[PDB]
């Protein structure tokens with residue numbers, strides 16, 4: 223066919239990173255489905271081909287594994303689905319309707335990528351070993367692959383949710399940070415009560431530096447923020463409950479939401495006994511956190527996706543602090559995308 | 565002369581990193597000045613030549629500057645001072661006495677290296693600019709150069725303090741961490757009261773996981789721990805006082821000392837308004853923290869010298885946490901030394 227042909231062509235284009243303000247203004251009242259179709263039918267192949275060409279640069283030891291080939295076949299098929307709309311007339315309403323239906327099929331086709339790549343990592347460790355040189359290659363590639371996957375899913379979610387026939391797609395222009403914190407806590411508390419028959423309480427403190435009274439709002443994607451907070455709440459609850467099985471007092475989980483002139487920071491403090499520094503630095507490694515699991519590495523990619531970060535600093539024998547760093551301003555929240563270079 | 569000859573010879577040897585337990589046991593009752601002389605007359609040239617050969621690999625743009633040449637002339641002279649004792653008889657007490665006097669002269673000859681390298685960094689920025697590529701080369705070299713300098717000064721201090729004619733040289737086998745914290749605080753409070761006419765209070769909390777009652781002691785070099793804590797106290801006081809000039813309540817500085825099964829962690833928490841994440845990552849850069857200053861970068865090297873670390877995580881609009889990570893066990897406290905490789 224022409225799959226290698228399409229990859230080489232669109233990989234020469236660099237992806238166009240969009241800011242949070244561009245996502246908001248494009249999806250507002252002046253939202254034209256035709257304009258979004260013209261942009262996405264070009265930008266989606268560019269992002270697909272860039273990561274698909276980097277997959278080809280992997281060694282044949284990994285490229286010929288069933289896990290990588292299965293995922294690579296999904297990207298080939300999804301790329302071909304977009305190719306059909308290149309010559310189609312954007313002025314035809316049937317063209318726009320079929321394009322939205324085709325994006326949903328691609329989205330559901332890539333729904334089982336996280337467990338599949340986890341099987342690939344386990345296969346590599348049992349086939350070639352777990353050397354620090356291999357960990358860097360796997361960490362470097364999986365970070366770029368997943369971040370690419372997040373960005374593509376973002377574009378698809380914004381198109382299918384807006385043009386379905388307050389919230390701008392998956393974006394809340396007035397996202398109350400504390401409310402998302404409570405939701406992720408409540409879900410983690412539900413799971414923690416069913417399995418441990420006990421759960422720590424929650425304490426939330428807001429620090430709005432410029433407006434001490436005003437609640438802290440931001441423009442963000444609540445799903446991404448929930449995923450990070452839910453993952454951090456599960457870890458902090460597991461550590462708190464297990465480190466106090468012989469004790470009676472169950473320390474609460476303290477969360478501070480701070481809004482500065484540039485950052486919106488969310489610190490989650492637990493007293494779950496802490497973790498030695500040697501092990502903290504390996505909690506974000508796909509290879510080291512795989513056993514015959516990727517909550518922290520993926521959660522950090524969600525934060526980094528809009529120029530943020532997620533950092534851990536523990537104190538062995540006491541507890542652990544987890545901090546989500548987000549950009550406060552929508553103009554500073556720009557997509558971080560991997561680009562194929564030589 | 566034969567200065568390039570000695571450099572090429574001893575640079576082929578790798579430095580021998582010593583653990584904290586080796587420092588303690590060698591300097592104990594079975595401390596033989598002859599054995600320390602035989603080791604140091606070989607190990608000191610090896611460490612000198614390794615960093616001196618890496619200095620030669622610098623570009624001639626930096627190698628020909630007066631700052632680098634002045635420091636390089638100190639290392640050439642100090643290397644030649646040790647060469648005189650290679651053929652001397654260790655069984656002669658006059659040989660051991662002159663060797664100790666020669667180490668003191670070398671130690672005082674290298675007393676003005678930090679301000680000299682600071683002048684070199686400022687000269688480079690005004691001569692060739694402050695590009696991110698140049699920052700990595702300067703950061704990579706200065707970290708290794710200073711860490712090498714710390715290790716050499718450590719060996720000299722242990723020899724001159726022990727064989728001068730409870731503490732094992734510069735090492736306290738029962739170093740009370742909280743007491744060093746109070747000393748660094750008291751000195752910072754003295755300077756802060758004279759310049760700001762106000763200073764925050766101190767709060768210390770110890771978490772001894774294995775022995776909740778016992779005070780937290782360790783085997784460490786109190787001078788190094790004081791230098792790190794004093795630097796962090798100055799920053800936390802400056803930020804706290806200045807961020808509350810229009811306010812009346814002056815938040816205290818909270819310090820937690822946690823002793824785990826592997827780590828001894830010291831967290832210093834202030835409410836000095838915090839720093840955006842973008843600027844935190846540049847506080848450890850020699851090039852970015854230079855103006856027409858190196859407290860944090862050098863303090864981190866002291867921590868890393870015995871397999872520890874010093875990390876910052878702030879929250880803009882609230883405050884900053886600073887954490888010193890140290891190895892709890894003396895067997896895990898091994899010298900981290902840069903080695904000249906190809």
Ligand SMILES: CC(C)[C@@]1(O)c2ccccc2-c2ncccc21
Nearest residue numbers: 248249257258261377380381384
């Ligand atoms: C921001 C893009 C992902 C988007 O595809 C989009 C999604 C949803 C709503 C509108 C628009 C849009 N408008 C113009 C150009 C490009 C686009």
Ligand SMILES: CC(C)[C@@]1(O)c2ccccc2-c2ncccc21
Nearest residue numbers: 590591599600603719722723726
């Ligand atoms: C640990 C070394 C720096 C040292 O030079 C030393 C310093 C002080 C006291 C004793 C000894 C010693 N003893 C044996 C071998 C080597 C040495």
